[PDB]
């Protein structure tokens, strides 16, 4: 293993605590709700598919939105402008070929002007004090995938699917750190596809036992069981593609036997 893998993991574990949004922020937002956030995140999943953006870009955009809404009151009519600026910034940070501003305007169907998107970009940068290099569920998942005995494309696709569903529902997923969500998503995907469990090598790397992951796992199991009923369906549609081994079509396990 490269001699900086452990250093990066230790650093990302420090930064995920510093980049965490305020867990109870939505109760202090006078005009927006968890449901309007779910609608915005589901919409960004679709924007990502339309522009063939990385999963990481979507995860970063959600981190930026939750951090912005942690300190700034936003009316429902402007929530999509925050999301659009977040996705533009996430794209500039993470993408080889970020979509142009005129494309972000087009994808809002001219709800906002170019000037509005560029002014919101400045404001998001100011509120986040240019701290864009946030750890994501995705960054922990790709590290955890190196511990597979052996590597299984369905396990990887299903763990990504599960980590993505967590983005939609601020209740309960804002209670958990990205490293913990990734741990639950990886265990649940492994167990579903192969009947294997959270491996000893990841217990040593992370210090997480299956027991420490249990609260998050129980939440993520319910999310998985109820996904076909959720009002938001863009992530299920995405993970039906052959790109993702159609993993969203698999049956969730009935019990986890924890």
């Amino acid at each position: 293993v490269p001699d900086y893998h452990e250093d990066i993991h230790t650093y990302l574990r420090e930064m995920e605590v510093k980049c965490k949004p305020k867990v109870g922020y939505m109760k202090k937002q006078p005009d927006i709700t968890n449901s309007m956030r779910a609608i915005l995140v589901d919409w960004l999943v679709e924007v990502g598919e339309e522009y063939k953006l990385q999963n990481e870009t979507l995860h970063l955009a959600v981190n930026y939105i939750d951090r912005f809404l942690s300190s700034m009151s936003v009316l429902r009519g402007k929530l999509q402008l925050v999301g659009t600026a977040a996705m533009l910034l996430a794209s500039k940070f993470e993408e080889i070929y970020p979509p142009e501003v005129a494309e972000f305007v087009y994808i809002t169907d001219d709800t906002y002007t170019k000037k509005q998107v560029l002014r919101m970009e400045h404001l998001v940068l100011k509120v986040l004090t240019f701290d864009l290099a946030a750890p994501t569920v995705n960054q922990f998942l790709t590290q955890y995938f190196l511990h597979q005995q052996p590597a299984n494309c369905k396990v990887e696709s299903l763990a990504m699917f599960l980590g993505e569903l967590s983005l939609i529902d601020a209740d309960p997923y804002l209670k958990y750190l990205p490293s913990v969500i990734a741990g639950a998503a990886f265990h649940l995907a492994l167990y579903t596809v192969t009947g294997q469990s959270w491996p000893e090598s990841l217990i040593r790397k992370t210090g997480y036992t299956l027991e420490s992951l249990k609260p998050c796992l129980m939440d993520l199991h319910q999310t998985y069981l109820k996904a076909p009923q959720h009002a938001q369906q863009s992530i299920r549609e995405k993970y039906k593609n052959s790109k993702y081994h159609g993993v969203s079509l698999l049956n969730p396990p009935e019990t986890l036997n924890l």
Partner: protein, 285 residues
């Protein structure tokens, strides 16, 4: 901006300036914002330098909305120091100090999941007290474990690693080590190791010095997208001819920094432990 007196243009725009209230001498990096808003290069440089607090990385002091990045000022870059030392040469202990410090800076970048991707002498800043610092993080990227495909058009040609020239799907930390190997040789011999004038000339300059790589030296090389079985097969030159002034330890380290196979090329952290650095000191230029 009213608190800064521009002294002069030092790069291109970077100005030497003075804080009118505190007297602090700074470098102002002006980024023009004119139709896509804040450039990705500025967003990456600011966000990544905020996590890269190290004695061998240039300090970002402030950001002001135009967009001005306020940095610490250093008196000279390694390119101008090299030009000034072309007749004398850089003393061996100072070459060793500078490489040791560049590797400390780069090891810190890699340990914080940052690729520099433009290490060349003009981006390496020196002060009057014998420090050298990595600068210009406009081409840098936060990388993932493991990497995915990143921008292909990276590193100034003379300092560009063979896995980029041959179009590997994946590159990572090893590309920075390649650039520093080139810079090490350049400090020793007083000229660019691989001064290519095109991608093909750059590759052939590498092949003529280190030997045309084969499946034993670099497993997978003959399958790489821009590899051609018609490439001439040159033999490897003896490092006694490539870097004549360099001792056995120097030659061992340079050869490990220029390994063809990125998976075998020495890491910044392992380079710091090499016996070449056993007697390292911090002379003043």
């Amino acid at each position: 901006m009213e608190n800064f007196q521009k002294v002069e243009k030092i790069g291109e725009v970077v100005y030497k300036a003075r804080n009118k209230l505190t007297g602090e001498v700074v470098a102002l990096k002006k980024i023009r914002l004119d139709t896509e808003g804040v450039p990705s290069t500025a967003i990456r440089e600011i966000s990544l330098l905020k996590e890269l607090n190290h004695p061998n990385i240039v300090k970002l002091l402030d950001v002001i909305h135009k967009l001005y990045l306020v940095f610490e000022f250093l008196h000279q870059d390694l390119k101008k120091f090299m030009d000034a030392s072309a007749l004398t040469g850089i003393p061996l202990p100072l070459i060793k100090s500078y490489l040791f410090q560049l590797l400390q800076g780069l090891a810190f970048c890699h340990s914080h999941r940052v690729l520099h991707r433009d290490l060349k002498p003009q981006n390496l800043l020196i002060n009057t007290e014998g420090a050298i610092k990595l600068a210009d993080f406009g081409l840098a990227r936060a990388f993932g474990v493991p990497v995915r495909t990143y921008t292909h058009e990276v590193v100034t040609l003379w300092y560009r690693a063979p896995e980029i020239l041959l179009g590997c799907k994946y590159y990572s930390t090893a590309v920075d080590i390649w650039s520093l190997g080139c810079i090490f040789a350049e400090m020793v011999t007083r000229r660019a190791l691989f001064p290519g004038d095109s991608e093909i000339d750059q590759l052939f300059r590498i092949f003529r010095t280190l030997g045309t790589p084969d499946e034993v030296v670099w497993p997978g090389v003959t399958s790489m997208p821009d590899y051609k079985p018609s490439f001439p097969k040159w033999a490897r030159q003896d490092f006694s001819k490539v870097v004549p002034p360099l001792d056995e330890d120097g030659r061992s380290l340079l050869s490990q920094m220029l390994h063809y196979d990125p998976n075998k090329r020495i890491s910044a952290k392992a380079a710091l432990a090499h016996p070449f650095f056993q007697d390292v000191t911090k002379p003043v230029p």
